[PDB]
């Protein structure tokens, strides 16, 4: 489909077999999700944003669908504010940004 | 034009004469640019995302041009890490999400 970004590019998206809604993020290089538990073990992260950084866990090879789009990949967990849908996600759905 | 997101999708803006690196930013309500003096009178104002809040300048009714594309629009100015095109201005020049 085509979003245009009159209002933040909100979708759901379902990852452990939970919806969530998510942010398309073309400005995030990774995905982020707020506090949840996901299987295997993690490694540690740092990430910066606009006000600083934060440590998350990541976790590799998890599945989790995007507007009906499936995509296995890195998934962090952490305190952001919002869940972030980033480039690593959006190059496997075939997400790009036209004008 | 048609911007894959395999790279961060920087482009060059053009504002108060000057020419600037920027990040098209779906994720990012608004424009935040590094610290520069634009014309006109400005409001503080708090913008948060990932790591916290900075305290920004808010500017309103700025020109701007990304990619040759004239657009007007509120430009927020602080110490953001890196120059900032938001939906506010995003909208204007017809960028939209595909996939
Ligand atoms: O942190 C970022 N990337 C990093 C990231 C993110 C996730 C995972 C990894 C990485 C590494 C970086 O690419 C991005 O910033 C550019 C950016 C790029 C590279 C380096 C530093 C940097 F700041 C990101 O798209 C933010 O813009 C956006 O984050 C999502 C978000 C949405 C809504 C509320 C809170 C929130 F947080 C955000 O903070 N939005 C707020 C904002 C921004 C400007 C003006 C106003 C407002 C209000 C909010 O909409």
Same mark, same amino acid.
């Given at each position: 489909?085509?979003?245009?970004?009159?209002?933040? !590019?909100?979708?759901?998206?379902? +990852? *452990? &077999?939970?919806? #969530?809604?998510?942010?398309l @993020?073309?400005?995030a290089?990774?995905?982020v999700?707020?506090?949840?538990?996901?299987?295997?073990?993690?490694? !540690?992260?740092?990430?910066?944003? +606009? *006000? &600083?950084?934060? #440590?998350?866990?990541?976790? @590799?090879?998890?599945?989790?669908?995007?507007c009906?789009?499936?995509?296995?990949?890195?998934?962090?967990?952490? !305190?952001?504010?919002?869940?972030? +849908? *980033?480039?690593?996600?959006?190059?496997?759905?075939?997400?790009?940004?036209?004008?």
């Open positions: 489909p085509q979003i245009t970004l009159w209002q933040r !590019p909100l979708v759901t998206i379902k +990852i *452990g &077999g939970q919806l #969530k809604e998510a942010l @993020d073309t400005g290089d990774d995905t999700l707020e506090e949840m538990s996901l299987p295997g073990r993690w490694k !540690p992260k740092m990430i910066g944003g +606009i *006000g &600083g950084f934060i #440590k998350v866990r990541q976790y @590799d090879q998890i599945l989790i669908e995007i009906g789009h499936k995509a296995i990949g890195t998934v962090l967990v952490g !305190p952001t504010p919002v869940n972030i +849908i *980033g480039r690593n996600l959006l190059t496997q759905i075939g997400c790009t940004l036209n004008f």
